Design a protein around this ligand. Sequence first.
Ligand code: 0S3
Length: 557
Amino acid sequence: HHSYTWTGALITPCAAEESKLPINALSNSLLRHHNMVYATTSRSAGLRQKKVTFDRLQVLDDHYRDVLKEMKAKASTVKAKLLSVEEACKLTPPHSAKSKFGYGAKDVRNLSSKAVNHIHSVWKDLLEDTVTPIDTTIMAKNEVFCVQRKPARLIVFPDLGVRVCEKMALYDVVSTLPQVVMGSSYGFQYSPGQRVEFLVNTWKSKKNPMGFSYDTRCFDSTVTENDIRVEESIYQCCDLAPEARQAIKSLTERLYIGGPLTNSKGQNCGYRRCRASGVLTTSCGNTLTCYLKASAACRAAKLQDCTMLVNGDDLVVICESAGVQEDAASLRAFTEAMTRYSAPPGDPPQPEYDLELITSCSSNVSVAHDASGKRVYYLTRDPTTPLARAAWETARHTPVNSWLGNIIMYAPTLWARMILMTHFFSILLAQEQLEKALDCQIYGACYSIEPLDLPQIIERLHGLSAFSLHSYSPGEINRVASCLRKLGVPPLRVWRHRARSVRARLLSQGGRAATCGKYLFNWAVKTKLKLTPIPAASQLDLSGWFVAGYSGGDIYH
Ligand SMILES: CN(C)N(c1cc(C#CC(C)(C)C)sc1C(=O)O)C(=O)[C@H]1CC[C@H](C)CC1
């Protein structure tokens, strides 16, 4: 029951790949230790193939089936609709991978006859054939990190025509089902501020809280044919059109369960019998399966009053403590149960009795103070990867602007405000590009965002306190400072000076630009303004943000 089998053909690049951090005139203003930053390339694909290839064994007990029955009962309340061809086309990112059948993402978005005809033919074929595995392409991802190097992650995805069909059959399902099945445990329904609120309120709801994150080793590879069929059985609990039931059955049999892997040059690389990382159902499937396995494991371990928080393969559990010794024993039992279910750990879990010490989705809860001096909880993370990616983006235009996504998601943090806002608004000003919409990703979905709208977005998501936080925790301050020394980033005095300059120039522009100056950089001046609500904020349609996760699912808004 191997996760993959391989022919020996190589995983190949579809374009020239750079590993070394590109440098321009702006690089040193952000960081000096350039050799610390790198991008992964296909040259390490082989190392990744070795790590992701293993046999899976699965022993399923009564706890597992009990939880599954409960999940199905909730799923049976869901009613889901097919998307029209047009609706599905409009969810396609403008720069999504072109089809091998003579049309591209722009053709799809424009409803061109060629694209629409092909999409219709793929759909008809899904209804007519529920057996033949569907081809997929395997690629090595090019992602940027700071040293201590990782081998490239792999991405596996079907052709554009198939991706459009996935949306038609399953977009409504994967957008609505998880919150119904998992309720408050479904992580993607929360903005960062809402996630912090759920965590804190959950922590406070326990008499003696204990919590832990659980890291499954190579989660996608641990997902078995059983797991993927169980996921389909959950989808089929929904009230669906018969046409939708057939398309979903077909996609499960032909795509989700496994299929051939083809490299960028059309060679057969091998065969997958685990989760594909680049299909619409990757996020929802991982979320449901992680939740199922973990909920059953809690019962096997006899953890008391477990509250889970699940985002794909990312898992946090907060429960009622039974004592330090009992807690540690129960956690080992939990891990043993997860392992029997084919979800063994990478790092062994550790019980935590301080909420701020739990890291999940690479983030943690921390505390600062607003202008009135009151304690405010917010979401932060180690800034190392955000800053390394920011350095790459300083010198190269890339498909996704991580710096923009990070400012949005981590707006209240010491590091995003001091460094990312300052650095990138300086660059935007110099190039007169403040109004140019840029692509970023939020929970895996792609969004086109004008940087001038940032103050409203931030106020809607985080509230006005995001612009006045100060007196950060010693732990957070030290982590940021350590990162700055590691990468060779300039000191606070430098950033404050640059911020005052950026702010001054923004104010002189008037309009939204002045709003950016006033709100984003109020922290940098001696005599601070008392910030009030931004009128146009109400106008933004953020209904669609923070509904569901779409990592790998080729979704655009
Ligand atoms: C108290 N004063 C000196 N601070 C302030 C500066 C801090 C720092 C730092 C290093 C990581 C460079 C060591 S923490 C902090 C703190 O407020 O805890 C502020 O006013 C900050 C408010 C937020 C803004 C983005 C940057 C300045």
